[PDB]
Design a protein around this ligand. Structure first.
Ligand code: CLA
Ligand code: CLA
Ligand code: CLA
Ligand code: CLA
Ligand code: CLA
Ligand code: CLA
Ligand code: CLA
Ligand code: CLA
Ligand SMILES: CCCCCCCCCCCCCCCC(=O)OC[C@H](COP(=O)(O)OC[C@@H](O)CO)OC(=O)CCCCCCCCCCCCCCC
Ligand SMILES: CC1=C(C/C=C(\C)CCC[C@H](C)CCC[C@H](C)CCCC(C)C)C(=O)c2ccccc2C1=O
Ligand code: SF4
Ligand code: SF4
Ligand code: SF4
Lengths: 74, 45, 80, 82, 73, 742, 135
């Protein structure tokens, strides 16, 4: 389900911006998934709180780290 | 040449025979792709 | 306690009784094998459940089985 | 045809070569009085004529199939309780 | 530090102190190759003798370099 | 008893007969395989010489021959590295321009597209940039051309073949007896004198005559071709006296103790060379002279054939006291009758020493033009810290193997080993408490900081602009080190390192070393380190103290060192063995050392490394963000892992693309470990049953029957892939970031 | 019970609060000489020449200890269960003969007069007190 929702999300996130070419050109190899989907889209998430301030994505940043902690406690 | 019998039994053992055979196979593929590279598909007439 | 059963495929080689670390097992007289002895488990209240008896058993698909059950102080192996 | 059909035929021929030679070697060594020792130490005098013979694995496989020698019976090989 | 016979006599004094301690408190001072005298030596082996004089050189070099560093010698 | 040479002549005949017999060494493996478990047991038991034979003399002969084989392969490795520096290298182009040519060996052959890895590394050369620092080592050796490297590599090949012949010789022709090995006083005297002191004295001779004149002419900036060959410093003495005027007096001030004449080339300068950023070669020569004299003196402590000296047994028996019973009576018999006890001590202390070497070589960079090469500085630090951690876990493993196999209660009776056994519950429960305390007050402070920063409350954080945790003791120690020249160390000019204080030393516009200021983030991360080491020590010490018995399983030493469990009873007794504690401790060693090398990388890029302005302003690589971002987990996520992995994932279609490939392949191997870690073998054996059915159907079932891996092997494969994947991930990440920003 | 407690300086591995509250065990043996053995709780102790008496937390401790008393050729070891009422029962060996040897007067307990593939299905015994292994 992680594969199917990563796929759904990255394809639609291309459509929602007018850039299907990013998915169509970069999903044939795994670094495109890694870079253009995991690295590129997590940028604004982990800036939900930072040394300069806080915006409305700080719950989701805190939850993101929380989920890493619960997963690794497993 | 009784020691050579033991040597050919050592070559016949599974890791040594595997590394000789796979070295030959990797050498065939590497020397084929030195001379005829970039074959994504078989070209048709 | 746990439950330790013995089936009639026993050949009486005494190895489960030697394997037991808590004296659950013993050898009783019999006429069902050449060795003329079975295993028997009278002290199953002392069974920790460690299944050394099943490891020691040589008959193909064991003549002794441990069925794990209600846990007590002895079966949990607690020294406190 | 060169995109997938030609490499398909080429792979299936080489893979049937490898598999048929391995099957022939395991069947040839199961009668020679210590089978397990000959699996880690290869009989070259048995294996090398088999790897030379393996060019005609499709004809050998079809003759193995029609004569009922390709498969063992379901009553001859082990299973677990249902 | 230019060499003077004060440096020689402090090296000899450190050798005498070290052979004194080597006579007083070595557990096995009589090894196999013994000295020819063994009466002016107190009863030694040659390895115990040159052990004592090597340690006297340790002490003497340390002494003369320390006293040169102070300003005495 | 005296130390002498007694040798059996021709113990074992040289023949290829047993090479045709796999597993000839074990009596249970010599019967041949029935299952595939046999094949893995052949490799698990290949070097377990206690299972080979029960006789300590043949065990010792096997160990002594296998050491020569290992020395042969290490000398082949070293002569290979020197040969690549001779032939496939830009070393001569690097000598002329050490600040702008990147060091490279390993040209890649042009096949399937892989010649993109031949980057423009400068000097008119294409290849892979190297980070092992061999260029700096050959530079500090004074090597000026390729032919000297060819001579060194040929001599290394000769020396490797000579070791390999010595290993053949001392197992088949002339093999020593048992009492030859048990002359530990003789061996300590010879190692401390010849192997350490005479070696360091001969190296001081090389440094005085070859390395220091050639490197002094390099620092003057003459040429690579105008600097003469180093035998013209011995034959023509005027070339020394032009450089080092202390040679005009000759050897007469050495024997007349006028040692201040030699102060030209035996300095105590303290800091770094401002041209290279390395240590002064006269300091290094003087170091090796002092160290050599101390080692030669130290190797006379121990009694041998001539009465004078010490019995180590008599030293150990006198060090008892009122708390510790008999003291160290019996520890001599442990270390002279058990090779595992020796391997435990040497492995633990050699790993601790390599971690010390890693901390010393970043802060006091020895080699010329090493400190400005930030890639080499990162890589050799992290490399030797990993070697340290692995060797320490090995020392714990062999301590536990001693405790299972070679421990004798009759030898160890009311001594310090017997007394630590008899209060092992107190030791382990207090260490449990310590580990929980350190976890709460190291990591919970980061969780506090995360939550306070996310809740919009940065005035409540533990930081430098909020509630402060200053490292007052480490700041005090660094103050004492800054003030040591002229004060407590009067004959030093500059401090030992610039990491404590003394100012920025710039070489080629980049920082060689500058003061490393310590604050709240540094307080927090040093307690992370204390926590993760103490937990690793808890796991390994628990496995060594409970290797023979616990409250749960009394006869644990009957079950061995390496066993999976003792069944699902007693609640379940999985992973009670000492081996399983080594297993669990490898992960915590990994955890600890990953945080150590991450601390290092981000503290250096944030607060040390960087470019120096012509005015004198230091502009760091990550711009001083360690102080406010290393105090949360979100900061370490974003500003360290997310921000610095920009260069390994953008690396395709360039010279660093193999680093991105290794990055993804290492994540693969890491994730692939978890199949082995999270599962057990009943599943895998039952799946193999249906696959063996499909082979029995087509008459392709092998007589060597397929088995799933043993419980111990499944754990071993899981930890080997977990470590391999995680370390290769950090390797590719570090390489691709530091070859781009530094 | 009769016997001298073996000579050692104590350990943290010994008897805890379970001994005074529910159960305590003891092993006695006679030794021909004084010699060093290994305690089940960890550590070296010396057994006395003559009878001995060492208290232990669990029965398994005494069976491990009596297993290593076979290696000193001491085979008269007896194990006692001790309750906080002072009630001492003799448990091992319980018959007087070690259980490896067949002695008469021993009855079968938990014997099933069938092989193990002849147990009933769990659905055949469902919603009753019996298990598939019970007879
Ligand atoms: C079994 C594998 C294998 C095979 C089939 C070949 C086949 C070949 N190699 Mg080759 N090679 C191999 C392994 C192999 N090599 C390995 C392992 C190495 C590394 C030691 C080399 C190193 C090598 C060199 C250095 C050269 C060849 C050359 C050649 C060609 C020789 C042509 C001729 O007339 O003679 C031929 C295609 C030569 C050639 O024709 O290249 C121009 C040549 O110069 N090979
Ligand atoms: C199962 C997965 C898979 C598949 C289907 C392929 C398929 C292919 N790869 Mg590939 N590859 C894979 C995995 C795979 N690879 C992996 C895991 C890696 C990483 C190491 C690579 C790395 C890689 C590179 C770097 C290259 C390829 C190339 C190729 C092409 C083969 C050209 C060739 O040698 O044919 C010719 C082979 C023969 C004619 C076989 C002759 C055998 C004997 C002599 C015949 C006997 C007659 C009976 C082909 C499209 C090459 C290519 O051309 O790319 C387009 C190329 O450069 N691959
Ligand atoms: C003699 C070689 C041989 C042959 C003919 C087969 C045949 C088969 N295997 Mg297979 N297998 C083998 C070796 C072999 N196996 C080995 C060594 C292993 C352990 C790695 C397995 C593990 C394995 C699994 C786990 C599964 C099969 C399955 C199958 C079936 C479907 C084809 C397939 O999935 O292949 C896949 C097989 C592999 C990927 C294994 C690699 C094959 C090796 C590299 C080649 C062996 C050649 C041999 C060593 C050379 C000896 C020659 C002699 C001259 C010395 C088919 C009956 C599947 C099945 O049951 O489906 C119904 C299945 O799930 N195999
Ligand atoms: C007459 C006796 C004498 C005197 C006055 C000195 C004096 C000195 N020794 Mg010295 N030394 C001596 C005997 C003596 N030594 C002997 C017998 C040995 C051999 C064991 C040494 C071995 C020795 C060493 C190895 C060193 C000294 C050093 C020093 C100097 C500084 C020590 C210091 O302040 O550290 C203060 C330390 C505070 C913690 C000082 C001038 C040091 C030196 O020369 O530094 C330049 C030094 O490194 N000594
Ligand atoms: C021990 C460390 C070490 C390492 C890691 C390397 C690594 C390398 N060397 Mg090298 N080398 C070394 C030591 C080392 N060398 C030493 C000591 C010498 C002096 C003798 C050399 C002399 C040398 C030369 C002269 C050359 C290299 C080259 C190379 C590169 C390619 C090698 C290759 O493809 O072989 C091919 C590998 C095989 C054919 C494998 C053989 C397979 C057999 C059958 C395995 C045996 C198993 C069994 C027992 C039988 C590679 C980076 C080449 C350079 O490539 O780059 C341009 C090159 O020209 N090396
Ligand atoms: C293993 C170490 C080692 C070796 C082999 C040499 C070897 C040599 N040194 Mg020497 N030296 C050494 C360590 C060493 N040194 C150290 C540690 C120092 C510092 C105390 C010196 C200080 C020194 C001086 C000052 C002189 C030599 C000289 C010499 C040469 C002639 C020696 C002689 O006349 O008898 C010879 C090449 C002489 C020479 O001509 O140098 C080229 C000379 O004048 N050495
Ligand atoms: C490795 C270093 C080391 C350390 C840290 C200690 C620490 C200590 N020793 Mg000590 N000791 C040592 C080595 C060491 N010992 C050695 C090698 C010996 C020779 C066997 C002794 C012999 C010794 C005696 C005889 C006594 C101490 C005592 C003490 C205690 C100090 C007095 C006090 O606080 O009251 C203290 C815990 C005293 C103590 O408290 O004992 C009850 C005491 O009486 N020690
Ligand atoms: C992220 C993953 C993770 C975490 C959190 C832990 C946590 C822990 N492991 Mg560990 N472990 C892990 C992965 C992890 N492990 C893995 C992957 C392995 C496999 C090899 C192991 C193997 C292992 C062993 C073998 C050992 C441990 C030990 C420990 C403990 C360390 C000492 C301690 O108490 O620290 C303090 C606890 C923490 C720092 C955890 C976080 C606590 C938070 C910050 C505070 C609580 C927040 C809040 C107040 C809660 C309120 C909740 C709300 C409902 C009100 C701790 C409980 C050791 C142990 O037990 O020693 C005592 C030990 O021996 N673990
Ligand atoms: C493994 C690492 C141990 C470190 C753990 C730290 C806290 C644990 C303390 C637990 C109490 C243990 C009870 C001891 C056992 C006991 O019986 O104590 C008594 C013991 C002395 O015993 P005896 O006098 O019988 O000893 C005589 C013979 O045993 C031979 O010495 O004293 C200690 O060693 C206390 C000192 C330990 C204090 C550790 C000091 C560490 C020094 C660090 C130097 C580092 C470099 C510093 C540079 C600035
Ligand atoms: C996946 C997995 C397996 C399955 C893995 C097995 C059975 C071993 C892996 C198969 C080996 C690698 C096959 C080797 C076969 C031949 C040597 C291949 C020869 C091919 C030639 C070309 C060399 C376990 O057995 C296991 C056991 C205990 C805990 C966890 C696990 C676990 O997670
Ligand atoms: S499970 Fe253990 S205690 Fe129970 S009978 Fe078997 S071996 Fe004995
Ligand atoms: S159950 Fe097994 S070990 Fe026990 S008596 Fe029967 S065959 Fe022997
Ligand atoms: S789950 Fe596995 S390791 Fe654990 S007790 Fe059971 S068989 Fe043993």
């Amino acid at each position: 389900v992680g594969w199917v929702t990563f796929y759904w999300h990255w394809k639609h996130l291309g459509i929602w911006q007018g850039n299907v070419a990013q998915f169509n050109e970069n999903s044939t190899y795994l670094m495109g998934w890694f870079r253009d989907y995991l690295w590129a889209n997590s940028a604004q998430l982990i800036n939900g709180y930072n040394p300069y301030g806080v915006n409305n994505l700080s719950v989701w940043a805190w939850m993101f780290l929380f989920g890493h902690l619960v997963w690794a406690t497993g | 040449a009784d020691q050579s019998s033991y040597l050919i039994k050592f070559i016949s053992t599974a890791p040594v025979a595997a590394t000789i055979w796979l070295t030959i196979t990797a050498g065939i593929l590497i020397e084929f792709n030195r001379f005829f590279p970039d074959l994504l598909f078989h070209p048709l007439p | 306690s746990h439950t330790v059963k013995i089936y009639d495929t026993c050949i009486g080689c005494t190895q489960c009784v030697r394997a037991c670390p808590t004296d659950v097992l013993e050898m009783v007289p019999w006429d069902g094998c050449k060795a003329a002895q079975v295993a028997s488990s009278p002290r199953t209240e002392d069974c920790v459940g460690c299944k050394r008896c099943e490891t020691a058993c040589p008959t193909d698909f064991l003549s002794i089985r441990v069925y794990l059950g209600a846990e007590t102080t002895r079966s949990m192996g607690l020294a406190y | 045809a060169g995109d997938f059909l030609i490499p398909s035929i080429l792979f299936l021929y080489i893979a049937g070569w490898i598999g048929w030679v391995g099957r022939a070697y395991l069947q040839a060594i199961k009668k020679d009085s210590d089978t397990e020792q000959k699996e880690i130490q290869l009989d070259l005098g048995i294996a090398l004529p088999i790897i030379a013979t393996g060019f005609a694995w499709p004809a050998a496989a079809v003759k193995e199939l029609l004569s009922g020698e390709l498969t063992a019976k379901d009553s001859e090989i082990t299973v677990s309780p249902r | 530090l230019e060499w003077s016979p004060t440096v020689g006599i402090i090296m000899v004094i450190a050798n005498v102190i070290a052979i004194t301690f080597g006579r007083q408190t070595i557990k096995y001072p009589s090894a196999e190759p013994a000295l020819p005298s063994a009466k002016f030596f107190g009863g030694f082996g040659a390895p115990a003798l040159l052990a004592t004089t090597a340690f006297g050189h340790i002490l003497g070099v340390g002494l003369v370099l320390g006293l040169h560093n102070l300003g005495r010698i | 008893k005296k130390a002498r040479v007694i040798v059996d002549k021709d113990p074992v005949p040289t023949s290829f007969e047993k090479w045709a017999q796999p597993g000839h060494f074990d009596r249970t493996l010599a019967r041949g395989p029935k299952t595939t478990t046999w094949i893995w047991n052949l490799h698990a038991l290949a070097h377990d010489f206690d299972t080979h034979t029960s006789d300590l003399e043949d065990i010792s002969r096997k160990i002594f021959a296998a050491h020569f084989g290992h020395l042969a392969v290490v000398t082949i490795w070293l002569s290979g590295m020197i040969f690549h520096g001779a032939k496939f290298s830009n070393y001569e182009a690097w000598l002329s321009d050490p600040l702008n040519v990147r060091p490279s060996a390993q040209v890649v052959w042009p096949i399937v597209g892989q010649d993109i890895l031949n980057g423009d590394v400068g000097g008119g050369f294409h290849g892979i940039q190297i980070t092992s620092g061999l260029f700096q080592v050959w530079r500090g050796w004074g090597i000026t051309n390729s032919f000297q490297l060819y001579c060194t590599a040929i001599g290394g090949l000769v020396l490797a073949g000579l070791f390999l012949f010595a290993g053949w010789f001392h197992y088949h022709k002339r093999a020593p007896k048992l009492e030859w090995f048990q002359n530990v006083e003789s061996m300590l005297n010879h190692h401390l004198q010849v192997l350490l002191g005479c070696g360091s004295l001969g190296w001081a001779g090389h440094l005085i005559h070859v390395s220091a004149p050639i490197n002094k002419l390099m620092d003057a900036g003459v040429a690579v071709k105008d600097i003469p060959l180093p035998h013209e410093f011995i034959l023509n003495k005027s070339l020394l006296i032009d450089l080092f005027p202390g040679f005009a007096a000759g050897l007469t001030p050495f024997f007349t103790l006028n040692w201040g004449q030699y102060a030209d080339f035996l300095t105590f300068k303290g800091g770094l060379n401002p041209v290279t950023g390395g240590l002064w070669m006269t300091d290094i020569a003087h170091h090796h002279l002092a160290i050599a004299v101390v080692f030669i003196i130290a190797g006379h402590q121990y009694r041998t054939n001539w009465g004078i000296g010490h019995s180590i047994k008599e030293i150990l028996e006198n060090h008892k006291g009122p708390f510790t019973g008999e003291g160290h009576k019996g520890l001599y018999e442990n270390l002279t009758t058990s090779w595992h006890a020796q391997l435990a001590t040497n492995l633990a202390f050699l790993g601790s020493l390599t971690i010390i070497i890693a901390h010393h070589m970043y802060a006091m960079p020895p080699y010329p033009y090493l400190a400005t090469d930030y890639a080499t500085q990162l890589c050799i630090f992290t490399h030797h810290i990993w070697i340290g951690g692995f060797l320490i876990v090995g020392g714990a493993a062999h301590a536990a193997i001693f405790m299972v196999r070679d421990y004798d209660p009759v030898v160890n009776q009311n001594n310090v080993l017997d007394r630590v056994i008899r209060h092992r519950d107190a030791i382990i429960s207090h260490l449990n408490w310590v580990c929980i305390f350190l976890g709460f007050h190291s990591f919970g402070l980061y969780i506090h900081n995360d939550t306070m920063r996310a809740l919009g409350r940065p005035q409540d954080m533990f930081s430098d602009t909020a509630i402060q945790l200053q490292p007052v003791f480490a700041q005090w120690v660094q103050n004492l080190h800054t003030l040591a020249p002229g004060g407590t160390a009067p004959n030093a000019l500059e401090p030992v390192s610039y990491a404590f204080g003394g100012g920025v030393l710039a070489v080629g516009g980049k920082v060689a070393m500058m003061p490393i200021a310590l604050g709240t983030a540094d307080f927090l991360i040093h307690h992370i380190h204390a926590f993760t080491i103490h937990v690793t020590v808890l796991i390994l010490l628990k496995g060594v103290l409970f290797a023979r018995s616990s409250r749960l399983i009394p006869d644990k030493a009957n079950l061995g060192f390496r066993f999976p469990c003792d069944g699902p009873g007693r609640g379940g007794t999985c992973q009670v063995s000492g081996w399983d504690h080594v297993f669990l401790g490898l992960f915590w060693m990994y955890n600890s050392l990953s945080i150590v090398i991450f601390h290092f990388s981000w503290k250096m890029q944030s607060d040390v490394w960087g470019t120096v302005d012509a005015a004198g302003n230091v502009s760091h690589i990550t711009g001083g963000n360690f102080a406010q971002s290393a105090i949360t987990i979100n900061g370490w996520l974003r500003d360290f892992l997310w921000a610095q992995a920009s260069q390994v994932i953008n690396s395709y279609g360039s010279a660093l693309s193999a680093y991105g490939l290794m990055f993804l392949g290492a994540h693969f191997v890491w994730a692939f470990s978890l199949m082995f870690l999270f599962s057990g073998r009943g599943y895998w054996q039952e799946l193999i049953e249906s696959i063996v059915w499909a082979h029995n159907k087509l008459k392709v079932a092998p007589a060597i029957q397929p088995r799933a891996l043993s419980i111990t092997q499944g754990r071993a494969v899981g930890v080997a892939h977990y470590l391999l994947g995680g370390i290769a991930t950090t390797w590719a990440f570090f390489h691709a970031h530091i070859l781009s920003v530094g | 019970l009769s016997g001298k407690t073996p000579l050692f300086a104590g350990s943290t591995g010994g008897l805890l609060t379970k001994a005074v509250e529910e159960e305590k065990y003891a092993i006695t043996w006679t030794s021909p000489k004084a010699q060093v053995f290994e305690l089940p709780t960890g550590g070296a102790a010396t057994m006395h020449e003559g009878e001995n008496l060492l208290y232990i937390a669990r029965k398994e401790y005494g069976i491990a200890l009596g297993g290593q008393l076979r290696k000193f050729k001491i085979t008269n070891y007896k194990i006692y269960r001790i309750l906080p009422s002072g009630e001492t029962t003799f448990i091992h060996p319980a018959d007087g003969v070690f259980p490896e040897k067949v002695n008469a007067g021993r009855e079968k307990v938990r014997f099933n007069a069938r092989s193990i593939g002849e147990n009933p299905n769990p659905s055949q015994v469902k919603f009753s007190g019996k298990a598939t292994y019970d007879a």
